[PDB]
A paper describes a structure:
The ADRP–MES crystals also belonged to space group P21, but with a smaller unit cell and with only one protein molecule in the asymmetric unit. These crystals diffracted to 1.07 Å resolution. Two MES molecules were identified in the structure: one in the ADPr-binding pocket and another on the protein surface. The ADRP–MES complex, however, presents a somewhat different scenario, in which the 2-N-morpholine ring takes the place of the proximal ribose and a sulfonic acid substitutes for the distal phosphate. The latter group forms the hydrogen bonds observed in the ADPr complex and an additional network of solvent-facilitated contacts. The ring moiety appears to primarily be anchored by hydrophobic interactions with Phe132 and Ile131, and a hydrogen bond might potentially be present between the morpholine O atom and Asn40, although the geometry is rather unfavourable. The apo and AMP-bound forms contain the η3 element within the β6–α5 linker, while in the ADPr and MES complexes this region does not observe 310-helix parameters. With the R2 pocket empty or containing MES, Ile131 adopts the pt rotamer (p, plus, centred near +60°; t, trans, centred near 180°), while in the presence of a ribose ring it converts to the mt state (m, minus, centred near −60°). In the ADRP-APO2 and ADRP–MES structures, the last hydrogen bond is replaced by an interaction with the carbonyl group of Gly47, enhancing the proton-abstraction capabilities of the environment.
Residue numbers in the entry: 4 to 169
Amino acid sequence: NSFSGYLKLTDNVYIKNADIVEEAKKVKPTVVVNAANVYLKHGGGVAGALNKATNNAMQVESDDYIATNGPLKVGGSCVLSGHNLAKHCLHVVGPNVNKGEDIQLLKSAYENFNQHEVLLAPLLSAGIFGADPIHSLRVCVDTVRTNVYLAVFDKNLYDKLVSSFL
């Protein structure tokens, strides 16, 4: 958990302008969070990037999880191997607000983070699921009570988040 160059936003929430895949490789955190869908199909965005960095081992493992357990619920999670990225990957499903899932489920999604003392994570629902990222950060801050290190790759967004949260 050798996190470097983060800016503390609140007593437990930290942020860096960085690629989560590169952070995971440098730090090999205990837990990296994936922003997943309910069937754990890692076809793009952060999920696609994390899976690619595992050379598809994450996807094969995820398919086996679904074979045993069925799909996750929106706002739910499961813990699988982190392979070369982390000890564990916490796959968390935020709401797909652009397909009508309730934004209030973003609180339930972030509540999964509280099962782990320290996490490297992206913002949830802030890619193609369509939630405003600043809103997603505000829910993170209000909900997570463990120590979360957020990697935000887009500097334009990072600068807006730091401006809004100090």
